Design an enzyme around this catalytic site. Structure first.
Site, PDB file in Angstrom:
ATOM      1  N   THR A   1       0.822  -1.208   0.000  1.00  0.00           N
ATOM      2  CA  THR A   1       0.000   0.000   0.000  1.00  0.00           C
ATOM      3  C   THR A   1       0.858   1.260   0.000  1.00  0.00           C
ATOM      4  O   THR A   1       0.429   2.298  -0.516  1.00  0.00           O
ATOM      5  CB  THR A   1      -0.943   0.026   1.204  1.00  0.00           C
ATOM      6  OG1 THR A   1      -0.219  -0.302   2.397  1.00  0.00           O
ATOM      7  CG2 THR A   1      -2.092  -0.951   1.019  1.00  0.00           C
TER       8      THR A   1
ATOM      9  N   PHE B   1      -6.850   5.338   5.949  1.00  0.00           N
ATOM     10  CA  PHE B   1      -6.191   4.456   6.906  1.00  0.00           C
ATOM     11  C   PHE B   1      -7.170   3.751   7.841  1.00  0.00           C
ATOM     12  O   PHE B   1      -6.787   3.352   8.945  1.00  0.00           O
ATOM     13  CB  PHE B   1      -5.163   5.246   7.715  1.00  0.00           C
ATOM     14  CG  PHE B   1      -3.981   5.699   6.910  1.00  0.00           C
ATOM     15  CD1 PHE B   1      -2.977   4.808   6.569  1.00  0.00           C
ATOM     16  CD2 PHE B   1      -3.879   7.013   6.480  1.00  0.00           C
ATOM     17  CE1 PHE B   1      -1.885   5.220   5.826  1.00  0.00           C
ATOM     18  CE2 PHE B   1      -2.791   7.431   5.735  1.00  0.00           C
ATOM     19  CZ  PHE B   1      -1.793   6.533   5.407  1.00  0.00           C
TER      20      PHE B   1
ATOM     21  N   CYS C   1      -5.201   1.892  10.783  1.00  0.00           N
ATOM     22  CA  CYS C   1      -3.865   1.456  10.398  1.00  0.00           C
ATOM     23  C   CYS C   1      -2.840   1.788  11.475  1.00  0.00           C
ATOM     24  O   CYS C   1      -2.601   2.961  11.777  1.00  0.00           O
ATOM     25  CB  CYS C   1      -3.469   2.110   9.078  1.00  0.00           C
ATOM     26  SG  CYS C   1      -1.719   1.938   8.687  1.00  0.00           S
TER      27      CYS C   1
HETATM   28  C1  HEM Z   1       0.962   3.532   3.023  1.00  0.00           C
HETATM   29  C2  HEM Z   1      -0.362   3.502   3.007  1.00  0.00           C
HETATM   30  C3  HEM Z   1      -1.191   2.558   3.904  1.00  0.00           C
HETATM   31  C4  HEM Z   1      -2.506   2.453   3.751  1.00  0.00           C
HETATM   32  C5  HEM Z   1      -3.342   3.210   2.697  1.00  0.00           C
HETATM   33  C6  HEM Z   1      -3.006   1.512   4.718  1.00  0.00           C
HETATM   34  C7  HEM Z   1      -4.322   1.143   4.858  1.00  0.00           C
HETATM   35  C8  HEM Z   1      -4.844   0.443   5.916  1.00  0.00           C
HETATM   36  C9  HEM Z   1      -6.245   0.316   6.256  1.00  0.00           C
HETATM   37  C10 HEM Z   1      -7.426   0.950   5.488  1.00  0.00           C
HETATM   38  C11 HEM Z   1      -6.329  -0.440   7.351  1.00  0.00           C
HETATM   39  C12 HEM Z   1      -7.622  -0.855   8.079  1.00  0.00           C
HETATM   40  C13 HEM Z   1      -8.101  -2.163   7.460  1.00  0.00           C
HETATM   41  C14 HEM Z   1      -9.401  -2.572   8.095  1.00  0.00           C
HETATM   42  O1  HEM Z   1      -9.928  -1.802   8.939  1.00  0.00           O
HETATM   43  O2  HEM Z   1      -9.902  -3.676   7.763  1.00  0.00           O
HETATM   44  C15 HEM Z   1      -4.992  -0.828   7.742  1.00  0.00           C
HETATM   45  C16 HEM Z   1      -4.653  -1.613   8.821  1.00  0.00           C
HETATM   46  C17 HEM Z   1      -3.378  -2.023   9.143  1.00  0.00           C
HETATM   47  N1  HEM Z   1      -2.213  -1.610   8.530  1.00  0.00           N
HETATM   48 FE1  HEM Z   1      -2.075  -0.280   6.989  1.00  0.00          FE
HETATM   49  N2  HEM Z   1      -1.931   1.064   5.465  1.00  0.00           N
HETATM   50  C18 HEM Z   1      -0.782   1.685   5.002  1.00  0.00           C
HETATM   51  C19 HEM Z   1       0.486   1.472   5.520  1.00  0.00           C
HETATM   52  C20 HEM Z   1       0.838   0.507   6.451  1.00  0.00           C
HETATM   53  C21 HEM Z   1       2.181   0.167   6.892  1.00  0.00           C
HETATM   54  C22 HEM Z   1       3.468   0.845   6.371  1.00  0.00           C
HETATM   55  C23 HEM Z   1       2.089  -0.825   7.798  1.00  0.00           C
HETATM   56  C24 HEM Z   1       3.216  -1.548   8.577  1.00  0.00           C
HETATM   57  C25 HEM Z   1       4.298  -0.920   9.049  1.00  0.00           C
HETATM   58  C26 HEM Z   1       0.687  -1.138   7.968  1.00  0.00           C
HETATM   59  C27 HEM Z   1       0.174  -2.098   8.815  1.00  0.00           C
HETATM   60  C28 HEM Z   1      -1.155  -2.252   9.144  1.00  0.00           C
HETATM   61  C29 HEM Z   1      -1.695  -3.095  10.191  1.00  0.00           C
HETATM   62  C30 HEM Z   1      -0.887  -4.013  11.134  1.00  0.00           C
HETATM   63  C31 HEM Z   1      -3.023  -2.973  10.173  1.00  0.00           C
HETATM   64  C32 HEM Z   1      -4.010  -3.672  11.126  1.00  0.00           C
HETATM   65  C33 HEM Z   1      -4.235  -2.772  12.337  1.00  0.00           C
HETATM   66  C34 HEM Z   1      -5.172  -3.461  13.289  1.00  0.00           C
HETATM   67  O3  HEM Z   1      -5.889  -4.394  12.848  1.00  0.00           O
HETATM   68  O4  HEM Z   1      -5.179  -3.102  14.494  1.00  0.00           O
HETATM   69  N3  HEM Z   1      -0.041  -0.314   7.133  1.00  0.00           N
HETATM   70  N4  HEM Z   1      -4.109  -0.269   6.842  1.00  0.00           N
HETATM   71  O1  LIG Z   2     -14.596  -5.005  -1.948  1.00  0.00           O
HETATM   72  C1  LIG Z   2     -13.653  -5.609  -1.572  1.00  0.00           C
HETATM   73  C2  LIG Z   2     -12.184  -5.117  -1.500  1.00  0.00           C
HETATM   74  C3  LIG Z   2     -11.585  -4.951  -0.075  1.00  0.00           C
HETATM   75  C4  LIG Z   2     -10.094  -5.359   0.105  1.00  0.00           C
HETATM   76  C5  LIG Z   2      -9.101  -4.556   1.005  1.00  0.00           C
HETATM   77  C6  LIG Z   2      -7.823  -5.307   1.512  1.00  0.00           C
HETATM   78  N1  LIG Z   2      -6.753  -4.618   2.287  1.00  0.00           N
HETATM   79  C7  LIG Z   2      -5.475  -4.553   1.994  1.00  0.00           C
HETATM   80  C8  LIG Z   2      -4.797  -3.818   2.956  1.00  0.00           C
HETATM   81  N2  LIG Z   2      -5.680  -3.478   3.843  1.00  0.00           N
HETATM   82  C9  LIG Z   2      -6.834  -3.957   3.433  1.00  0.00           C
HETATM   83  N3  LIG Z   2     -13.881  -6.956  -1.172  1.00  0.00           N
HETATM   84  C10 LIG Z   2     -15.157  -7.585  -1.103  1.00  0.00           C
HETATM   85  C11 LIG Z   2     -15.616  -8.191  -2.421  1.00  0.00           C
HETATM   86  C12 LIG Z   2     -16.804  -9.125  -2.246  1.00  0.00           C
HETATM   87  C13 LIG Z   2     -18.019  -8.643  -1.853  1.00  0.00           C
HETATM   88  C14 LIG Z   2     -19.075  -9.508  -1.697  1.00  0.00           C
HETATM   89  C15 LIG Z   2     -18.925 -10.849  -1.926  1.00  0.00           C
HETATM   90  C16 LIG Z   2     -17.709 -11.321  -2.313  1.00  0.00           C
HETATM   91  C17 LIG Z   2     -16.665 -10.462  -2.461  1.00  0.00           C
HETATM   92  C18 LIG Z   2     -14.955  -8.685  -0.083  1.00  0.00           C
HETATM   93  O2  LIG Z   2     -13.919  -9.333  -0.045  1.00  0.00           O
HETATM   94  O3  LIG Z   2     -15.796  -8.971   0.744  1.00  0.00           O
END
Ligand code: HEM
Ligand SMILES: O=C(CCCCCn1ccnc1)N[C@@H](Cc1ccccc1)C(=O)O
Ligand code: HEM
Ligand SMILES: O=C(CCCCCn1ccnc1)N[C@@H](Cc1ccccc1)C(=O)O
Ligand SMILES: C=Cc1ccccc1
Ligand SMILES: C=Cc1ccccc1
Ligand SMILES: C=Cc1ccccc1
Lengths: 436, 444
Positions: free
Chosen positions: A249, A374, A381
Site C-alpha cells: 500500500t 487508513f 492502520c
Molecule cells: C501507506 C499507506 C497505507 C494504507 C493506505 C493503509 C491502509 C490500511 C487500512 C485501510 C487499514 C484498516 C483495514 C481494516 O480496517 O480492515 C490498515 C490496517 C493495518 N495496517 Fe495499513 N496502510 C498503510 C500502511 C501501512 C504500513 C506501512 C504498515 C506496517 C508498518 C501497515 C500495517 C497495518 C496493520 C498491522 C493494520 C491492522 C491494524 C489493526 O488491525 O489493528 N499499514 N491499513
Molecule cells: O470489496 C472488496 C475489497 C476490499 C479489500 C481490502 C484489503 N486490504 C489490503 C490492505 N488493507 C486492506 N472486497 C469484497 C468483495 C466481495 C463482496 C461480496 C462478496 C464477495 C466479495 C470482499 O472481499 O468482501
C-alpha cells in the site's frame, strides 16, 4: 427506505460483477449509478456498499459497528492467521498484539527507524542517478523495491536487497502468487507457497540471536494487560502481516503521488521548491522530513483520489438504523468504498476529480470521517505514521534530486490486486547533480 | 549574514514616532518600499522586524519554528477580549478548548444553517437600496458595517442589532468602536479621562454580552455551541467567563474586517468596469431564484475571485505577529534568537513582484483561477496555520452572497469619481466611499 441493487445474474446474484480485473473501479461505477448505498448479494453472503460521508460517519461509530473480516481478509487470514490485520477485535490476540506493538510506531520509534529509511532511500536515488541517457524508470516496480526493503530493514533488520535484483525476492514471489489465489478465489501452489513464507520467517527469527525494531518488541514485549508476551505462532503471523501490510500500500501511494505530480506541473514545482529549501543536508534528518508540509499535502491528496487500501468492512454490533431509513440487524455487513467517499461532492465540492493538495492545508477544515484512507477507530492502520514518514522522506528526496518527465504521456491504467497501483507508469529522471 | 536596515530614529524614542500618524499601515508600507523585504523597528522596551517578501514569510509561517505573538495592538484588545480566541496565546489552555469547541460551528457544512439568516440581513440591504429616491447615494462602508454587524449578531447569537433601522449605530458598538480607538491610540501614546472612559466602555460591552449570556430552547448558532459544547480532549465545556469573551471577540472579529472587504470589493469593481460586467454576468446566470441558496453562492466562482483579489490589495486585517520558538536563521542570513518578534506586513507581501509580476497594483481577479499556481504562503489575508482566521469561510460566504445579490439587483455608478482614502483603525476601510445604484427592478 428500499435499498438499490445492481443487475443480477440469476442464482449467482451479483457475484459475476466481481468477475472482472478491476473490481473496485466497477464498484465505483455502480456507486455512481445507484448512489450512497446499494445492496450486494452473493451465494451465501449479503453486504451493503456505503459511499457517502453522511452514512459512513455513522458506520464509523465504534459503539454501533465493529471491524468485519471481508472475504478478501478471510483469504489473507489463511496465511496471516490472527495477525493484527486479519484478527477479530474480540480475539484475545488482537488487543494483546495491539498493546505490545503500538509503542514501536510512536514518535520516539519513528526517530529510530529514520536512519534505515534513509539507507534504502539513498539506494533508490543512486539507482536513478546511475541510469544512462534516454533510459526510463518503471515507477511502481522501483517503489515496491523501496517499500519492501524499508519494512524488512526497519522492522526486522533483514535486507531483501531488492535493488540488486531483476526478479523480486523469492519470498514475495510466493506472496504475489498466494495473494493472487486469494483475490482470484492452483491449490497446490498455494500450499507450497505458504510454506516458503514460513521458511523466511524462520530465517528472520533465527538470525535475531542489539536492535530497536519491530522484531525486538515482539520477542521481548509484554502486554501490560495480561502481562504475557506473544507466543511463537503469533509472532510468525505478525511478521507475515507486517511484511505484506508494510510495503504494497505504501508503494502504491508513492506511485500515485508521482503520477499526479507529473500530470500537474504547478503542483510539482511547489513541492519541488519545498523539497529544495527544506532538505539542505546531504541526508535528510527526521526533523527536516516533518517540515515537508506541502509534500505531505501531496500524499494526502493522492490518498484521496486513489487510496491504495480501497475498502474496509464493518458489521453491526446490535440492531440499529442507518441514516434513519435503512434498518440493520445484528451481524449485517457494511463495506466502506473509500474512493467514492473521497468523491462526495457535498463534502469536497464539485472539483472532486481534480488533484489539489491545497485542500489539506487545514486538517481541521475537513469534516469528521470524510477522509479515511487508513481505516477507522481502534482498528485503524497501526502503520500510518511509518507509511507517511517513509513516503514523505522518499518523495522529498526524489523531488530534490531529479526533474521528472512524462515522456510517454502515460494514460492512467490502475491494476487491481487487493491494493491499487498505476500499471505501466514510467518516467524519465533528469538528475540535478546534487551530491549525497 | 546580513545587517538589518532600519528607518529613521528619534533619539530615545527610537522608531516609535513613525507610528504617530493616522495611517500607520500605509506608512509602514512606504518604509518597506524604501528598505526592502526586512527592516528592524525599535520602540522603548520593544523590538520587532517587519517582513514584506514571500521569500522570508514562507519561512516565518513554519509552525515548528514560529508561533503566534500578541502584538501591542492585540495586547490592548485583550483588556476586553480577554483570553478569547483571537487574543489568547497558543499555550493558554482556553485557546485549544475554545478552538476545539468552536470549529464545528464554522465548518463548511455549518454555513448551510447560517445561510437563511445571512439572506435575512442581505434582503434588508437590497430593500434599503431600492427604496432610495432618485439622485440619492449610498454610503458604502457605513451600510456594509450595518450588514456585517447584523449578520454576526443574528447568525451567531440570535440577537438583532437592527442596524438598518438606525442612524446612530448601536450603543454597544459605540463603546466597542471607541474602545478599539483608545487601544489604537495607546501605541502612539493626565490621561485620566481616557482611562475613565475605557473602563466605562468595557462596562457597556460586557453588560450587553451578559444580557445575552444571562438571558439565553436551543439554536443552531454559535452561542449554542458555546453553552453546550464539550472539548473532545478534556471533556470540559467553556466556563462562563470565557464565553462572554468569545462573544465580545466574535462580535468584533465577525463584522469589522468583513465590511472592509465588501467595501474594497465594490470600490475596485466600479473602478474596473470590465471586471464589474463579468461579475454582474455571473450573478445573473447563477442567481436565478428570488432568494439565493447555499449552492448558488458556492457557484459564484468569479465573485469569489473578486473578493480574493480585493483581499490581496487591501487585506482588512493588515498584519499579524510571530515569535521564534527557538534560535533559528531566517533566509540563511538573518539570525534570530528565541523569543524574537516578527511582523508580517500583509499588504506588502501581496505586492511581491517576484510572485505576482510587475502589474501588482492592477485589479485582476483572474490571478486566483488556479490555487495550485500561487506559490506557498504568498496570499495570507486570513493569517497562518492553526492560528488562522476561524471565521474565514463565514466571511467569504457572507461577502459572496451579499456581493452577488448587489450585482444582480443594481447597476452602480462612481458618480463622484471617488479618490481612495483608506482610514486606519486596527483594520482598513475606504473612507468617504459613495456610489449611486440604479435598481434593475428584479423582485425578491
Ligand atoms: C501507506 C499507506 C497505507 C494504507 C493506505 C493503509 C491502509 C490500511 C487500512 C485501510 C487499514 C484498516 C483495514 C481494516 O480496517 O480492515 C490498515 C490496517 C493495518 N495496517 Fe495499513 N496502510 C498503510 C500502511 C501501512 C504500513 C506501512 C504498515 C506496517 C508498518 C501497515 C500495517 C497495518 C496493520 C498491522 C493494520 C491492522 C491494524 C489493526 O488491525 O489493528 N499499514 N491499513
Ligand atoms: O470489496 C472488496 C475489497 C476490499 C479489500 C481490502 C484489503 N486490504 C489490503 C490492505 N488493507 C486492506 N472486497 C469484497 C468483495 C466481495 C463482496 C461480496 C462478496 C464477495 C466479495 C470482499 O472481499 O468482501
Ligand atoms: C474578510 C474578513 C476577515 C479577515 C480578513 C480576517 C482576518 C483574520 C486574521 C489575519 C486572523 C489572524 C490574526 C492573527 O494571527 O493575529 C484572524 C483570526 C481570527 N478571526 Fe478573522 N478575519 C475575517 C473575518 C472573521 C469573521 C467573520 C470572524 C468570526 C465569525 C472572525 C474571527 C476570527 C477569530 C476568532 C480569529 C482568531 C482565531 C484563533 O486565533 O484561533 N474573523 N482573522
Ligand atoms: O500596527 C500594527 C498592526 C496590527 C493590527 C492587527 C490587529 N488585528 C485586528 C484583527 N486582526 C488583527 N502592529 C504593531 C505596531 C507596533 C510596532 C512596533 C511597536 C509598537 C507597535 C503592534 O501592535 O505591535
Ligand atoms: C481461521 C483461520 C485461523 C488462523 C489462525 C488461528 C485461528 C484461525
Ligand atoms: C467489538 C467488540 C466485540 C466483542 C465481543 C463480541 C462482539 C464484539
Ligand atoms: C525491471 C527490471 C530491472 C532490471 C535491472 C534494473 C532495474 C530494473
Amino acid at each position: 427506505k428500499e435499498m438499490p441493487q445492481p443487475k443480477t445474474f440469476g442464482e449467482l446474484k451479483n457475484l459475476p460483477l466481481l468477475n472482472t480485473d478491476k473490481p473496485v473501479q466497477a464498484l465505483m461505477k455502480i456507486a455512481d449509478e445507484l448512489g450512497e448505498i446499494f445492496k450486494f448479494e452473493a451465494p451465501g453472503r449479503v453486504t451493503r456498499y456505503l459511499s457517502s460521508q453522511r452514512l459512513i460517519k455513522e458506520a464509523c461509530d465504534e459503539s454501533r459497528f465493529d471491524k468485519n473480516l471481508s472475504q478478501a481478509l478471510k483469504f489473507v487470514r489463511d496465511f496471516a492467521g490472527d495477525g493484527l490485520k486479519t484478527s477479530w477485535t474480540h480475539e484475545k490476540n488482537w488487543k494483546k498484539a495491539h498493546n505490545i506493538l503500538l509503542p514501536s510506531f510512536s514518535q520516539q520509534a519513528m526517530k529510530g527507524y529514520h536512519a534505515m529509511m534513509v539507507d534504502i532511500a539513498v539506494q533508490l536515488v543512486q539507482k536513478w542517478e546511475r541510469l544512462n541517457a534516454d533510459e526510463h524508470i518503471e515507477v511502481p516496480e522501483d517503489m515496491t523495491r523501496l517499500t519492501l526493503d524499508t519494512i524488512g530493514l526497519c522492522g526486522f533488520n533483514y535486507r531483501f536487497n531488492s535493488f540488486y535484483r531483476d526478479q523480486p525476492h523469492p519470498f514475495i514471489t510466493s506472496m504475489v502468487r498466494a495473494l493472487d489465489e486469494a483475490m482470484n478465489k492452483n491449490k497446490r501452489q498455494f500450499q507450497e507457497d505458504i510454506k516458503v513464507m514460513n521458511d523466511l520467517v524462520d530465517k528472520i527469527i533465527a538470525d535475531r540471536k542489539q536492535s530497536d525494531d519491530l522484531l525486538t518488541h515482539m520477542l521481548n514485549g509484554k502486554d501490560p494487560e495480561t502481562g504475557e508476551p506473544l507466543d511463537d505462532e503469533n509472532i510468525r503471523y505478525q511478521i507475515i502481516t507486517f511484511l505484506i501490510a508494510g510495503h504494497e500500500t505504501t508503494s502504491g501511494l508513492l506511485s500515485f503521488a508521482l503520477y499526479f505530480l507529473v500530470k500537474n506541473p504547478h503542483v510539482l514545482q511547489k513541492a519541488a521548491e519545498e523539497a529544495a529549501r527544506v532538505l539542505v543536508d546531504p541526508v535528510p534528518s527526521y526533523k527536516q522530513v516533518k517540515q515537508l508540509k506541502y509534500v505531505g499535502m501531496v500524499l494526502n491528496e493522492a490518498l484521496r483520489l486513489w487510496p491504495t487500501a480501497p475498502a474496509f468492512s464493518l458489521y453491526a454490533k446490535e440492531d440499529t438504523v442507518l441514516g434513519g431509513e435503512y434498518p440493520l440487524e445484528k451481524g449485517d455487513e457494511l463495506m466502506v468504498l473509500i474512493p467514492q467517499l473521497h468523491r462526495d461532492k457535498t463534502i469536497w465540492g464539485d472539483d472532486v476529480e481534480e488533484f489539489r493538495p491545497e485542500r489539506f492545508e487545514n486538517p481541521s477544515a475537513i469534516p469528521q470521517h470524510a477522509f479515511k484512507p487508513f481505516g477507522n477507530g481502534q482498528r485503524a492502520c497501526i502503520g500510518q505514521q511509518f507509511a507517511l514518514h517513509e513516503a514523505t522522506l522518499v518523495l522529498g528526496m526524489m523531488l530534490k534530486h531529479f526533474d521528472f518527465e512524462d515522456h510517454t504521456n502515460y494514460e492512467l491504467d490502475i491494476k487491481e490486486t487487493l491494493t491499487l497501483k498505476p500499471e505501466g507508469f514510467v518516467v524519465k529522471a533528469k538528475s540535478k547533480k546534487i551530491p549525497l
